[PDB]
């Protein structure tokens, strides 16, 4: 049936005994199955003396050869010819178990043969290119004779005339076309260096000076017939070199194109056998007996599937020797396994970056998928910015298949990882903007206002409003653009944030309840849950319920003044019964009663758990940490309010100083003014707001889940579960 994951599933430690002959095939099929984590067996044996070292270094050499081939591919005009298909074939290996085969030796031999042949071909091509460059200079035709860059010919002439104070003939001519310089590796201009002078020593000095200026010289025949014969011989040699160069280039290009058609497949495969041999050395192999034997961690609810797959492999192979496996129930802590769909993978990863949920308790990864986006939206509520961010997410979701086969890069790396979080994030932003009725800090008018202005408002005079109705969803749009609006919004958020944060605390602490109840934990529940729950309720839940009742009762209509919220909170701690105006009858009795209850929670939280105490030192620090931490988180819940105001008035000022100036005088120049100002406003609204403060509120709503939620029930770190599997990583680069 189903094997979904709240926090984990019961997983088993299984030991493997396998025959030597089918050991590699079993490792390959297990790797393409990828479900078991092998614990440490021969970690004492260091790397330089492992069992499979020689094939490890052989595979390293062939990997280097493949990297050399890919270097040639990128140097030429081809890249990943099979990347479209080979990547899919490796990805299609899931639930397919492709055969591996003993063609690894053939792969190694063919790779070495291709490597040496390509090395020889590359050496031939570079040498023949050097010859071609040399002959082009030698092809020049009109004592000493040579060619040199046309930039330095004047300097050469001047220095020659200076160092040789005597006279000499100079008949330099610029080359018709630039020639690729060997040293400069650039197609710079060139010029002839024909010169004639008497004196053997003078000629030798001139030759040395010319060679000192990176000038190449040739034995140009003075006689017309000899020069013509030399030119004809050079032309014939150049034609032969052109022919052989074309043949070599065609052969090299064909070889590289053939290699690129399957290089990705061999690279992915050889990486898979690299992992296979790494796991092989990780085993407890011993050549004195049945060679391979090892142990591993498997989920219990797929041991039957694993055994069936192994039996299918054994049927595929010719060996009839059984290789069954059995569970070994040790006392060690099992790893932590979390199945997750694409809609939850990023959520769970971000949630457990704090720590690893050790076992079959209740984790925090599941509630995150909903609490995270809604906390961010509470801190971010706006139809405009939320709509932009949701369109970004949606455009990152529909083209998922396009993005799965490409690298996002340092602009969208975290975005690619958080590809689905921001979608539900933007949906909750839709909600919060529906409630926080501002759109780019401007309020919508879809619903009729419940508050009516006076029929005759004086221009410039203060104007009051009478509550002649109520607004169905969100704040009444009459609040927009009023002095008292901000205060009303501060009070409302205060209370909204405090209620949401308290309810999040209660939800996490009930997760702690479920965690404790899953195990026996009879001492743990009585020692920690009930006293802490009673304290937390009696203070903060009482605050919440009296807030709700304060909202429920029509204080203006009832005649009774609305008591100060924080005073009704704290005069409990100062002097019970000191009530300016009770919320409900018998209020002071409730105050003293549950205040005494909260006070006696502390000895309850301190005494009952350490009973047999040796763990009293841990218990007392846990108790004080819990109480101060509860009050700290309850206070921290006010920065949802803080971010809400930051976003609201930041959008307000941005709109007021961009769009409220865009219209200007509404002239012909006003059109350009509003175009430029809306361009600036959009650039800011995106880059500043939805990136900077969008990420800020995202990360702060994430701070919620780091500390306030998980510190209540995340007991500690557990062993991560990473089964031996291939992933087709590093298609081209690593």
């Amino acid at each position: 049936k189903e094997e979904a994951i709240f926090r984990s599933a019961e997983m088993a430690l299984v030991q493997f005994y396998i025959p030597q002959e089918i050991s590699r095939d079993s490792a390959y099929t297990l790797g393409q199955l990828g479900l078991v984590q092998f614990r440490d067996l021969n970690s004492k044996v260091r790397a330089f003396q492992r069992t499979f070292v020689n094939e490890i270094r052989r595979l390293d050499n062939v990997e280097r050869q493949y990297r050399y081939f890919y270097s040639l591919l990128k140097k030429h005009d081809i890249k990943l010819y099979e990347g479209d298909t080979d990547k899919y074939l490796d990805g299609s290996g899931e639930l397919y178990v492709p055969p591996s085969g003993s063609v690894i030796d053939d792969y190694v031999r063919n790779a070495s043969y291709l490597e040496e042949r390509l090395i020889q071909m590359e050496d031939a091509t570079d040498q023949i290119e050097v010859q071609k460059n040399d002959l082009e200079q030698y092809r020049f035709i009109l004592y000493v004779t040579g060619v040199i860059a046309r930039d330095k010919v004047a300097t050469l002439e001047q220095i020659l005339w200076r160092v040789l104070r005597g006279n000499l003939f100079f008949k330099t001519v610029e080359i018709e076309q630039p020639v690729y310089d060997v040293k400069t590796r650039e197609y710079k201009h060139k010029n002839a260096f024909i010169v004639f002078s008497h004196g053997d020593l003078i000629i030798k000095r001139i030759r040395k000076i010319a060679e000192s200026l990176d000038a190449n010289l040739y034995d140009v025949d003075s006689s017309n017939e000899g020069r013509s014969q030399q030119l004809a011989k050079v032309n014939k040699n150049l034609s032969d070199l052109y022919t052989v160069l074309k043949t070599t280039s065609t052969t090299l290009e064909s070889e590289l194109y053939a290699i690129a058609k399957e290089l990705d497949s061999w690279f992915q495969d050889v990486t898979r056998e690299k992992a296979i041999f790494e796991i092989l050395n990780k085993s407890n192999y011993d050549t004195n007996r049945k060679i391979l034997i090892a142990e591993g961690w498997i989920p219990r609810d797929e041991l039957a599937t694993l055994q069936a797959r192994l039996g299918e492999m054994i049927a595929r192979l010719g060996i009839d020797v059984p290789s069954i496996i059995q569970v070994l129930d040790t006392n060690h802590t099992p790893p932590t396994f979390h199945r997750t769909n694409k809609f939850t993978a990023g959520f769970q990863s971000i949630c457990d970056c704090y720590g690893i949920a050790q076992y079959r308790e209740i984790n925090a990864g599941l509630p995150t998928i909903v609490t995270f986006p809604f906390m961010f939206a509470i801190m971010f509520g706006d139809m405009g910015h939320g709509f932009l961010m949701t369109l970004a997410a949606l455009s990152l979701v529909l083209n998922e298949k396009k993005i799965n086969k490409m690298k996002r890069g340092e602009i969208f790396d975290m975005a690619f990882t958080g590809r689905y979080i921001i979608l539900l994030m933007g949906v909750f932003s839709m909600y919060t903007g529906f409630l926080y009725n501002d759109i780019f800090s401007k309020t919508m008018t879809i619903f009729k206002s419940g508050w009516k202005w006076p029929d005759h408002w004086k221009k410039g005079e203060s104007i009051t409003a009478t509550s002649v109705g109520t607004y169905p969803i969100g704040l009444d749009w009459a609040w927009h653009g009023t002095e008292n609006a901000l205060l009303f919004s501060n009070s409302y958020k205060m209370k909204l944030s405090i209620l949401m944060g308290f309810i999040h605390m209660t939800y996490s602490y009930f997760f702690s309840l479920a965690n404790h109840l899953y195990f026996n934990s009879m001492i743990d529940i009585i020692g920690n849950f009930i006293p802490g729950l009673l304290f937390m309720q009696g203070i903060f839940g009482y605050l919440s319920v009296c807030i709700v009742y304060k909202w429920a009762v029509d204080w203006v209509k009832d005649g009774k003044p609305a008591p100060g919220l924080l005073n009704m909170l704290i005069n409990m701690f100062l002097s019970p019964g000191t009530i300016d105006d009770e919320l409900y009858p018998h209020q002071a009795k409730v105050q003293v009663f549950l205040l005494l209850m909260a006070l006696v929670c502390i000895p309850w939280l301190l005494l009952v758990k350490p009973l047999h105490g040796d763990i009293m030192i841990h218990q007392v620090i846990h108790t004080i940490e819990f109480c101060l931490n509860c009050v700290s988180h309850t206070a921290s819940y006010l920065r949802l309010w803080a971010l809400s105001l930051a976003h609201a008035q930041l959008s307000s000022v941005l709109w007021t100083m961009t769009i409220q100036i865009a219209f200007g005088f509404r002239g012909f120049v006003g059109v350009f003014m509003t175009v430029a100002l809306f361009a600036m406003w959009f650039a800011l609204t995106c880059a500043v707001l939805v990136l900077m403060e969008g990420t800020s509120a995202m990360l702060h709503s994430l701070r919620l889940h780091w500390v306030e939620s998980m510190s209540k029930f995340f007991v500690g770190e557990g062993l991560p579960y990473e089964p031996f599997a291939f992933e087709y990583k590093d298609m081209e680069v690593a």
Binding site: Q20, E55, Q131, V244, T248
Partner: protein, 159 residues
């Protein structure tokens, strides 16, 4: 190569390992006996050249190349004559003829690098033109050897 790969493979049985070692030693002795310049000369005397000598004698065994240098590149002239006869026969499309031509081209390329003087003999006998024509042959396996030989002749001797 199969025995080399088997020796590389980690056979579990000690008896199998000893047998593999003995077979490898026998194969190495046979290869060393195949590295005889006299054997290469005898093979070149007849047709259907084998591929085991020409990887050492026209190569690491520079003594064979030095001997082939004698009598004014007598062995090189004989090989060039054999190649010219094979080309002129018109049966290059034959698989056996293709293998013989490939072996001859490999030997000629090995000899040319060692003895640059043989380039003049090849040019006088038309070996250069024959090699250039063979560079366009459809036999890709023979084409690679022909291109290597042309690069060796043009790259070193023609320079």
């Amino acid at each position: 190569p199969t025995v080399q790969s088997l020796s590389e493979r980690k056979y579990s049985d000690e008896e199998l390992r000893q047998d593999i070692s003995n077979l490898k030693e026998i194969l190495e002795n046979e290869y060393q006996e195949l590295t005889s310049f006299d054997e290469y000369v005898a093979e070149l005397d007849s047709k259907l050249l084998c591929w085991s000598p020409p990887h050492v004698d026209n190569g690491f065994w520079s003594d064979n190349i030095d001997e082939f240098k004698k009598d004014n590149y007598k062995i090189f002239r004989q090989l060039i004559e054999l190649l010219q006869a094979k080309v002129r026969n018109g049966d290059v499309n034959a698989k056996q003829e293709k293998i013989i031509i490939q072996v001859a081209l490999n030997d000629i390329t090995h000899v040319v690098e060692l003895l640059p003087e043989s380039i003049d003999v090849l040019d006088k006998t038309g070996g250069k033109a024959d090699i250039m024509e063979l560079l366009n042959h459809s036999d890709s396996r023979v084409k690679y050897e022909a291109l290597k030989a042309t690069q060796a002749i043009i790259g070193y001797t023609f320079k």
